[PDB]
Amino acid sequence: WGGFSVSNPTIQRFFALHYLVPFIIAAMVIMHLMALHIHGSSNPLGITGNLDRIP
Amino acid sequence: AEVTQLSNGIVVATEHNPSAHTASVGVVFGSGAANENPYNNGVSNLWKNIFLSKENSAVAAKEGLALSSNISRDFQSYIVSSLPGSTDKSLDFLNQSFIQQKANLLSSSNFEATKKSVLKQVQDFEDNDHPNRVLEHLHSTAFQNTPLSLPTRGTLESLENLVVADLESFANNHFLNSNAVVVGTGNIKHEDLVNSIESKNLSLQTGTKPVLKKKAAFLGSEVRLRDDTLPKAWISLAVEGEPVNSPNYFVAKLAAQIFGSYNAFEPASRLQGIKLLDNIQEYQLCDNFNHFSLSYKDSGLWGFSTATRNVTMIDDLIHFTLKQWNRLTISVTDTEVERAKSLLKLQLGQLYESGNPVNDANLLGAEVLIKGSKLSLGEAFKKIDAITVKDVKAWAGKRLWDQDIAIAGTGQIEGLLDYMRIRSDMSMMRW
Numbered sequence A: 001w002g003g004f005s006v007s008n009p010t011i012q013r014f015f016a017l018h019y020l021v022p023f024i025i026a027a028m029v030i031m032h033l034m035a036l037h038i039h040g041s042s043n044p045l046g047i048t049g050n051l052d053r054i055p
Numbered sequence B: 001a002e003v004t005q006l007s008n009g010i011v012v013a014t015e016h017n018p019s020a021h022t023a024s025v026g027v028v029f030g031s032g033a034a035n036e037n038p039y040n041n042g043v044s045n046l047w048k049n050i051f052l053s054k055e056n057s058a059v060a061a062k063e064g065l066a067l068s069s070n071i072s073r074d075f076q077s078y079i080v081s082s083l084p085g086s087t088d089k090s091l092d093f094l095n096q097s098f099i100q101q102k103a104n105l106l107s108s109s110n111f112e113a114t115k116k117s118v119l120k121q122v123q124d125f126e127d128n129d130h131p132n133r134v135l136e137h138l139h140s141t142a143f144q145n146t147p148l149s150l151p152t153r154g155t156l157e158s159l160e161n162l163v164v165a166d167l168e169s170f171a172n173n174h175f176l177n178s179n180a181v182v183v184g185t186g187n188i189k190h191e192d193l194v195n196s197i198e199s200k201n202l203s204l205q206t207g208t209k210p211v212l213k214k215k216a217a218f219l220g221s222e223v224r225l226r227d228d229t230l231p232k233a234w235i236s237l238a239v240e241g242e243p244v245n246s247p248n249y250f251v252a253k254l255a256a257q258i259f260g261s262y263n264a265f266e267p268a269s270r271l272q273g274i275k276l277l278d279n280i281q282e283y284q285l286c287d288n289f290n291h292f293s294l295s296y297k298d299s300g301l302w303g304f305s306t307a308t309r310n311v312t313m314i315d316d317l318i319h320f321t322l323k324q325w326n327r328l329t330i331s332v333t334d335t336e337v338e339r340a341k342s343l344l345k346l347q348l349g350q351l352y353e354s355g356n357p358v359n360d361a362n363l364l365g366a367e368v369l370i371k372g373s374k375l376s377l378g379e380a381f382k383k384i385d386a387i388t389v390k391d392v393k394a395w396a397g398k399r400l401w402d403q404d405i406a407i408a409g410t411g412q413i414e415g416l417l418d419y420m421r422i423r424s425d426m427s428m429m430r431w
């Protein structure tokens, strides 16, 4: 809170943090895409997709 | 000295060669694999082999003669070779085989033995000859459900179902005087041949015209024969080309000469004036490639064939090649066109001025059957020298730019991308 209750300090820090987290999410999405890339996507049959890929 | 052409019922065509020490006399029919159907496919190939059968060859050999036969898409030939003096002995054999004999060569033992022979022959080709097998499949997919799609050797399925009757049916329908031309090449005079032919009589199915059918059509498509157990990837790719006697026949052949042929293992081949070579040698994209401009009566194929052990970079091989083709429409240079002219002339000269009478026999017969005469190198060379950069660009903008392609491949082709990725490369982005 930065005080005795939700007040000025709380709102100002929340806005600063609201600006920041989206960039952390972006970084986490890059990490998400990296994990995805090494094994590739799965498919609806649940079996190997290695025998028939398309760009 | 200008190739004579006389007709008295039977069209006789000769090409005298004073430097030749042998002579070739034979008959060329204007019917080939393109005149068969999916079910009798291979009948012509079977005929070629019974004609080259031991019994028939032994008879010819006793007379000091050599037999040759070639099954093509639009035509079919049967030639006898001998010394310039034994030229009349060739005619007797030829006359015998296509007028006297019939039940002799089509006997149960000869036909079955020959059938078994071509069966193992075709099986070996389909099993081991990868570059040619792929080129045959290019024709098959490009002209599917059309005459030009049938392989010249026939298919195993139709071959094993063929009986003596099928051979006879084809012979009665195609081996006709109206669909033939008797050729004479090497060291022989026209009069000597025409009088020796005019010596005999008879007709054997006179006035009879061959069967007709539906015309060849090109279809953008592909056939993929993946085989991961093979050491390379063999690919053939092409667009609809030019038929024989097309106004762009030479412009197309010259365009193909621009990109030419290549053998990575030949030192001089790596030094050719081909811009594509700068792109493909850095990471050695292929072992070899050869561009072509195949021409037939109803249609043609323009493109290339390639073989490669670089299975992870096939996409670059195809991409760079097609990007070079793009250039024929927008930026091909004058020197590329001039280099192509010189090399095309050399190619044609080597093809037509070969020291082989049988080759001349096949070429002469095939051409006279299609246009009634044979074009001379003198005229061909003149047409070639007249080709300009604008002619190449006009032809490319019509046949290459944003046009459908036919693809065939076998071996380790996992790296060959989907049809659309390859098809998109037939053009470039423009403002």
Ligand code: HEM
Binding pocket: A025, A029, A032, A036, A040, A041, A042, A043
């Ligand atoms: C901003 C958030 C996210 C982004 C941008 C994102 C993006 C992607 C993309 C582009 C793919 C590949 C295509 C697809 O399958 O949809 C993917 C796959 C996947 N994502 Fe996400 N994702 C996000 C959140 C999540 C969440 C919240 C979970 C799970 C708790 C998740 C689990 C997965 C999994 C398991 C796959 C693989 C699906 C498969 O191939 O079977 N993702 N994601």
Ligand SMILES: CCCCCCCCCCCO[C@@H]1O[C@H](CO)[C@@H](O[C@H]2O[C@H](CO)[C@@H](O)[C@H](O)[C@H]2O)[C@H](O)[C@H]1O
Binding pocket: B402, B424, B427, B428, B429, B430, B431
């Ligand atoms: C972030 C939002 C912005 C969106 C803006 C939208 C972008 C629109 C781009 C539109 C056209 O871009 C244009 O695409 C066509 C293909 O469709 C290209 O065409 C190219 O490929 C086509 C198709 O094989 C050929 O026929 C053509 O001769 C060739 O030039 C053209 O050269 C390019 O200039």
